[model samples]
Target: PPTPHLDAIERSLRDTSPGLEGSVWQRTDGNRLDAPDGDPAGWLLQTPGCWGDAGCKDRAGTRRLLDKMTRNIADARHTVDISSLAPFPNGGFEDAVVDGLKASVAAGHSPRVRILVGAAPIYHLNVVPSRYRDELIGKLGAAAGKVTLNVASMTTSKTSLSWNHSKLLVVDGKTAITGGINGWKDDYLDTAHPVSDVDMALSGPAARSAGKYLDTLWDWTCRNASDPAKVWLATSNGASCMPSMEQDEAGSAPAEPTGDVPVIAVGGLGVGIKESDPSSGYHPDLPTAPDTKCTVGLHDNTNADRDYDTVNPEENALRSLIASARSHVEISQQDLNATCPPLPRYDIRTYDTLAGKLAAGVKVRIVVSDPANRGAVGSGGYSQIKSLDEISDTLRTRLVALTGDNEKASRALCGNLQLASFRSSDAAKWADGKPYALHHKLVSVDDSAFYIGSKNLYPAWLQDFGYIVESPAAAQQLKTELLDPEWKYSQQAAATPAGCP
Candidate 1:
């Protein structure tokens, strides 16, 4: 039976975000929902230290994810694809992947392993140093010939500053994992001041869908690669650098049903070639040509006409999901500021949508990292919290204008919206001078559906990926196990004054 809330969400996507309603799921359409198999067995993977256990180690989630990834890699017979924003050269996760590939090769299997790391101009300096690539190749040993490692970035005549911030690992186009977890010591091994995060592991058609979408990204990366050699596949495997054309038309055809969970893979390519961009290095007529490039151009935030010309499937899906919420909406993000490149401006769409929901009597709760505890001294937390304060003020003003009563409007605002900063229960376990930061990018609506991925609430022109699962069980698990507990330990921020803007 169809529920009204889910129906509304479907209608919202089909109507307002028609770009996501294609007959054949397109990458730009954010990959259509997979046919319900029953409930695709999925694990809500989470890192430690968020549960307020001073004795909790931060390695559980990392170990679980790495173990799964390495196991999948070992079992993979045909392909392995992994992407991360900042994979540390000596990170245990990356090393495990390399070791897995080597073991697979030693076992007489020839899986085509492809790894993509971000190459952002400034951030890459420490995260992905100059020696990283060479070291990775060296670490691959005999498997180096079969494994292809490359870095992706958005470059223009002006600057090469943007990055491929998506995190995903797919094996044999059958099993996959995606979420906020990154390849860094602080993200995994750090006992104190470790980054708290979450990820989802999926096995079924949805995993295949995610794999195909990742292939499109690989195609984009290869086309955008400054050095073609770095993007080459193993000649023995007879695979092209561009694998988009080789995929099945039915999308998930290669994947056998593993479970019953219905999942949709959503992704975004920031400042890169999208299907809607001008055809400079791309070919609109020849879809599968090696000479073809992706749509090019960063989204122009300043120009209304051009702002949405570049499609971001992840953002579109997120907005639609939030807009269609009926009763309650929950979000857990690291930060919520508009820090996208080419320009920094308020994410008016997000703000407006949130305000509209609040005005409609929907209870909205958001949890973010505390400004003072968020690792860096002047991190984006301050700006993000301030933005929330401003949103509260604006919401109050709009309500007052409608009701013509300041106190009533203030009450409505307070009743509908709640914002809090996360305070780890195990704060004492933090390093002497550093504190653990919340790094989750999660959202659950009406206890019916939830989103988990690498896309933050903020606007950043970086490649990202996420999943929208319409399973009540999954949503409830996320809420009860993570969101609810986190909220219990959070510190609520006072509602802004009615007219303080």
Candidate 2:
């Protein structure tokens, strides 16, 4: 039985954006966490991987995601799929995965493994260094024969560029993990500068849906390959470039149900399929943007009828979930931008959606990474903190304008829209010159439905994946275990001129 929460979201998509509904939303049942006894059955929440004496408060289940992935890989008898932004060549997490793959092979299981890493360049610099590719292949060793490794790009044209910003692992099509956690040493092993993130591991039919999503991504990678021989790295066994799932594998079946959670597997292409493209059949007389070398016409277009949200699945899911909120909304993201600058923008559906919710008396709380941290700066002098502040001010301004310059009413409404950044409870935690960052792309609405995955709150032309689960228990567990703690230890953002509390 589909929960009203899930049904409302699906119904919204069907009415406003049927194309996204058909392509991105894969409804599945009986999805529960692959957790130990006593933990919640619907989802797994991790503590921010911290370092030094100021260890994590919820340390029991925090460090279990990587361990769970390794264990799943080792226990796999049929198939394994891993997708990440880049390979962490010598990273312990990557090594553990490799060891698990080797162990599975040595056990005579002969599981088919597909490893997809993003090769998108950052300002002409490859995120996955050239040396790391060889290092990953070298580390595979005996298990290379059963593994098919490929580096994927978001676009086929060299004139434009995007990233495959998805981090996921699917074992035997029965279990999967997806979230903002990356396969980087800083994300997992780095103590002084560890990145605080979140991920969810689930079992049952939704895992199969996740696996199929991976298969589609693999196919897209292969289809976008310009040089089949070079782009598709040769396996030790010299298999074809086709995805591993397409090949014959014995005992492959749907994942068994573990609980009653209903989930929607959502994904989106950065800029590949445009509504103008006849292949997509997505034209809906909506507003459009001009194409750029790296972006498409539909990249910034908005579906005004749908609260001015973008036409992508990931954003659509977010907008729909937040719009359904009757009480409150909790959002945790690395950063937030009102508009992606490089391209001429029209409307930021996410920002508009949140403003609408705030105006409607729905409480919204947002936690983002502190820009004061060293990690807040990006290549080319990009300031994440500045962008976040800009959006925060913009949101406040919109609220004031909507309230007809009523400062008291706007301030009252803004009080309900709490904004803060993650800060270590003890100031000593930042003495090492590198402070921990909040990297979670999480959102829970009314403690009834929540979203967990790789999509950030900013506009970007990158491939991403997210899952929306309609489970009050899981939502409350995430809040009780992760969100509430982070909120308690966070620093509030600067208030707007309108005196937004």
Candidate 3:
């Protein structure tokens, strides 16, 4: 048996179809600006506006996340999952997601709609304030009747607070999408000036791996809630919609397609939401194929609800993946706090490994956000960016340096290491004229692997979802269109911090 993976890639490249029937993973490139030159073929996924001098023009026929979502929902038949950190129906989300349900009901089709939203913010023992809960719920009340809307929280005795930050949507368990994009009016509105983010729309059996995460979260939270009905009822206001398994429907989850390639799904957290273990279904039994095959690795932070900071599959998986890269390691993260000093066991080790990789001549390119891009009041960005610089400086001292007597450039180890800060140059501003910061978390190792999710290079990402894909086609497309472009723009157009100078 040769392979169907390349066939999928070739078809996508030729624009002969929408997706590969047996693709291990497919790249759905989206932008926050206008379509590129030539009105590009196949999901010319774009946001509502422009970022740099990249001239804005929101094209239709498969541009904008909202446009794609509207069409997906309108045609969906069996089930839907709308899970996010911030979910507000107003603006256009409600209409784009719920209108389909309304039409389905009008036609006497009761397709299940599951919206798992994140609850309030919590820090150890204090209530770290954010938007009002009731205020948010007031808007969600429009999901009357058969809709099951539940709020998930990272609640445990020792835990301060945590919640899911995964942005995902699944229609009928056959097609699923996940990325950094949030569900709010501004995410789709041209006036709010959306930040640049990355998203993937995939079809076939592999989506079940993604959908399983949502189904597990739903069952665990509802089953363990202080009051099961209250979880949904509290958010429903006086609405009659109550969550029941029937809403998920029986036999509705489609069967995983029999494909020539492999697709894996993994997740993290042992304390709060790890009760069901996101990896229980798929991890232990992954096919023992070569590293170059389409392998999936699931990662998550140690469950803060149970063990504090211990046994995080996400931490270990990341370290191993970075180690496996023989040529280069490309990272685009929101911050460089993967290992804060406080948690040396969990944080600093990954940084050291990357340092070693650099010493061994592995190319490393990092694209990070600037503190100023986060606005004047935000100082956290400065701390992490500073840490990144310090780490780079510390690593340089460990490796041999060129001597002045030898007439070398003094920074021999610097050639393989490059870092850039991403800042928005477009006229459009996120708020108060503040630039949109680079907010996607991605890691592509060589040409065979990639990781995409909400997991930042931070020690305290309480709950997150990530996909470790071992597909050359998936990695190459993202590397060229998403990862490479981000690096180029950041390297040439943005600022580079002075590390330990």
Candidate 4:
């Protein structure tokens, strides 16, 4: 397995672009991040990016992030093609990756569309500000390849995060690396004790579900202090953080030419405007319309992009897809705030179908980032009703789960859902304590189906951004691994936590 993992990963680097040759360097050693001949390829992976925070210089941050990546991609002196799902802006150390990938292709290296994650970012103080989020989404939508990052945040400070998962990258149909690192600065840097993490650098189907998203990929963050109303505003002082309005022709990548077009279904935190006035997804003007999935039923954050971070029912047609789940169903999310009962047609009270599934014995598994348990007060809190008993873990038997670093998650959805707790083998430890968090929310159903791409378990998310459930060949491969011991071990190890019952 190691041989294949190394072989595939190495081959991906070698063939990522024309004339590109590459190698991995220990982050702490300060070795050249690129390889000899300066890598004719224009892409890179496992590199760190900028993180604006105190003591981030020696640790890692955005100050030294981007331009470095641009140089790395230029190593091949050629541009590589992407598949529309390409990069994770602030989660990992990808400084030289993209440029090297392009250079490799120019140097005659084969075309690949993936980049494995090395050091992923945690969303905390100096962890990753909203600016990074703004820029990342913009880049991904423009690239030839799709990009995915690890989302391991505990939300202790702000107490809003709750989706634990791995970070990964794939290129040119080669390898997949699932580990503790993110794309943010210092995420993978070698500290005195270092962040404890486990990244499965595997190939084949394992890489497929995890690897296939390399089809394409930002916003930038600000450093100076400004008005509270504009603090953390999209990098450019009230400008669109994700570049949704402009097109960067220079940054444009060639479309992925090898993989087949997948059956893609996206979910988000807004409403389906396909049938509404202005129908912009969620009609902010519709005061009486219903919204939400977790707050309403499940798939929390089903509509967080809206004004109150709630979903709009008349807008999200995607619910039609979820309601239509037949044989297999998988879910990934941050929280599940279903304040309204799960029954009703035109509002947030429309998750009764999930209970119906329990009646029919359908298999449902939800993997969310561990919650900090320290959130807002009253009705406006995160996942207001989260607990193992709420899921009645004692009742259901077909549900599956993977919770990030939190011990309580297992007990919360304990019912029929096959539940597990996941913490990165790698975590940022304090001087006297263990690491803080992990970020991820990925779903693969029967390997042939994937309920992934942002969006948490909470209902509000379903109606927000574009939550995607796509099936590339990666989905099918997951089906086989579901029963394999290797899969079990990987999943179990990732799920186990200290003091878990």
Candidate 5:
């Protein structure tokens, strides 16, 4: 059998050894000379907005990430599942990419498509307007039986009622996309001032974990139909109801899973705590793709076994990774406050931890949305940024004190602390003419740990799910893409946010 790694190397040589700019697909390995993972591969640094002198032709990575779903749906051989908080095909993601697949299915191979959207009450409140939800519901319904669709509102059952904020797409249980952005993301057309968001296309075995999460959500939605009478809706194309797993308009078997990169999918339910409290860190219930030389850990912050205020697995994971930081800790979150009282037990004061790391000679880079870009002042999260500002000031003062003079500050402190803010340029606006804000919830520590999910930096009892990936490569990527860019943009946010005090 031909070695997969060797084949990858040979392909690489052909694309780069000779005189060539190298095709977009050819350069997919980004910043790496050798491919470690086999057959299927993945990408990082898929920044949506553009800066510098980059034009449409220069922003291929951004285009690739955005168009990934359309291409996946069109290319999949069998089975597709899309679960989101609220998504509209008309909003940024047009029906154009999907139209050809439907036409091809009429004459040729048609992959099974499943679409799930959260119809939670909170979403009905401005986040995802009811009109837009109904419009999308009917749009999917108009696909006839071509699309198996469901609205997971859990209205009739209180036990299952919870906000489903996940954005996921799984194709053939082999490839997937999951992140903070739904199909209708912040900004679609304009990149000069792009809404700060992150999404990834998992094109190998790593996707199985993503697919597993979608499967659980899909099954739960099917089982928790509100009222059978209200379940089926008559659209212009007759009527459609929630789909069964046994529905058999499927296509050919999908490709065998590829790659050794590891990933785990974690989730929690509702504002109220649950019986099992799956949100705790490293719970046994979390699922991972089988057999790989990778370390992916997931934690759920929902209180299944304990009180919400008492138990937080995601926080446990956060502290553990921060504790592991030796040289640096790069944190990029929507907020970084420490309010709402401490846990009676071991309360990890997130800000304190980072400040302590700085005292211990650990380099720290923190990025957040500028105050002008943040939510209302009365909102609970405002204090987070303020607290970060205080910490930055205190660190600077302490550093200056130790060196006796400002000239010696950099050498004595070893250049290890920073706080930056991000706001879309006033020039960049969405289709609705709103500026983009920095809303990422990410943390990368040294070259050892990286995390992504819905966890804010503030001390909240919110139910969130995220992965603490123990990979130097992944951590480096996060630093390169998120920490570096934001730091470069917001240089003066040490004592105050860039603007709008």
Candidate 6:
């Protein structure tokens, strides 16, 4: 959120290269994906690749993209090489991350091939590598020396509540690979529950911006000789050098995903927050380009809102945006739990906007944590445990939810929308069947207008924390390019991904 570094990344994109391309997430109409340089040559997507869930292997569009990158990398120096991220049987993301890097370096590409990565598995506690200390460190390449791994997380990893999982790769400053493909893709699933994903291979300044974001994380995470807790394996090895390669995991593991599926670029939450004391100062992103224009807002543990003063009017004046509703609003999010810190409950007036929409004939389907809508959430906290049942008391009319109680088994949460309605049918198609509730928060209307980011679809998202906002075009591109594919993940992407309908 500082300058110079941000400035330098932007400046490098502008003045440094000859064929610079950028791709990022920002929806104007919430349907169309747009950026400073128009649409990318292509895009990347989120792909599922972890846990024991069957859906991890079921990702469709993702496998296709992985194949495409692998094919390219197989041919040339500037090849776009990528390896899906899945946990190694040994139990860690080290092998997976290292393999992806090893594949690129093995392809004969040097520092020329840039990579953009994000994932919680690579972090300690989830899974650390067994050997090849230097090679493991090479996974970041140049980024290892420069960017901070997870700069966006609050209070860093030591803090009780933080672990991220998102992996990306950018090559030739043109070819970018994304999706839910963690290197370990053997046991993961792409089903409705435990739905994990990654979308990659976007282009233009957006791509550069994303690369810069990765670099920022790399910078933030790097620990020096003086620091006790080393950030990366190599830095810990006491190497005052540039980026290098990590050794490849020896065993013939699973194959990567491949194909030509669209990917969407998802960004644009680059806003700053005002501390309790105005004099305490504000923390802001480096700032968007002067030539380009878009919206700017701030979100955090406190009451969140856009930084109006920072938003340049001329930049804001262009997209006379319009609201549209054509299909039902369906939301599916992993962490449907309580909103995290920095963000508080949203202003009711704003929530009423969508709630009012649901009031109309328009249908609204939300897949939150199934077990009291808590299991699906990466982080779950009940603010008022009593209020939860009260909600069941009212929504029981029309909604159908899976309540463990045998007495209320035949009943709905509220008379109007009985969650029990979907209980008797096939679960994969309908909500969770046989008393299991449909969980996860991924809301969208006919795939036209969808919101997918780190934020949950709760009042807290709007008011409490920082989350990215994709405009219409950006939103659509994200769905079509990224979300749609992961929705179609395969049964086995690590070795040979079986096609999913």
lDDT of 4 by residue, 1-501 (tens): 012212222232222211211101000111111222443211122122112111223432222334444443443222222111112333334434544444554565443222211111132234233434444444444331332221211111122222212233433322333322344333345343222222222223222222222221111112111332212332322332231111232234422222332222222112221112231232233223333232244332333234322212212333333444555455433333334543121223223334344344456554433333224321112233345233333222212222232333434333324433322222222232522222233444433433333333444212211112233343443344222322232244233222335
**CA deviation > 4 Å runs, candidate 3:** 1-62, 87-90, 120-160, 187-192, 227-254, 258-261, 274-312, 338-346, 375-391, 394-412, 423-433, 493-501
Question: Best-fitting candidate, measured by lDDT?
Answer: 2
Off by over 4 Å in 6: 1-62, 65-103, 112-166, 177-201, 223-233, 236-328, 339-350, 359-363, 372-455, 458-501
Each model's lDDT: 0.59, 0.62, 0.49, 0.29, 0.45, 0.30
lDDT of 2: 0.62
Predicted candidate 1 versus true structure: per-residue lDDT over 26-90, tens digit per residue? 22221222212453322767776347664454445555656666777787766777777654424
Model 1 regions lying over 4 Å from their true place? 1-42, 87-90, 124-133, 143-161, 226-254, 275-310, 340-342, 373-391, 394-408, 426-433, 492-501
**What TM-score does candidate 5 get on C-alpha atoms?**
0.63
- Model 3 lDDT, residue 392, Cα: 48
Candidate 3 C-alpha lDDT tens digits along 1-501: 222333332332223211211221222212111122453322223244243433334423114567567666666666777666644344666667766666544555546555665543332212111232343334435434544344343332233245556676777766666665666554345444355656655555556555666665666556656653213323333332323433244356445453333443444443454343222222221111121211222233331221222223454456556777789989877666432322221244456557667766788877766545532211212224433454444444434232322112223345677776664333333445554555667777877676666566655544456556566655666665666556655666433334322
Write one digit per residue (lDDT tens) for candidate 5, span 121-238. Answer: 3333242323443554454443435543343332222333344555566666665665555455334434444446666555653444455445544455555454532121222223
The Cα error of candidate 2 at residue 275, in Å, is 5.3
lDDT of 2 by residue, 336-427 (tens): 65233443232345666687788778888887776655331222111255434555556755555556666644654556767776664655
Give the distance in Å from residue 248's predicted Cα in candidate 2 to where it truly belongs. 6.3
How much is the lDDT of residue 194 in candidate 1? 62
Ordering by TM-score:
2, 1, 3, 5, 6, 4
What TM-score do all the candidates reach, one by one? 0.78, 0.83, 0.68, 0.41, 0.63, 0.47
Clashes of each: 10, 0, 9, 193, 8, 159
Per-residue error for 47 in candidate 3, Å, reads: 4.5
Q: State the weakest 10-residue window (summed lDDT) of model 4.
A: 22-31
Q: Which ten contiguous residues of candidate 5 have the minimum total lDDT?
A: 21-30
Q: Answer with 3 or 5, whichever has the higher TM-score.
A: 3
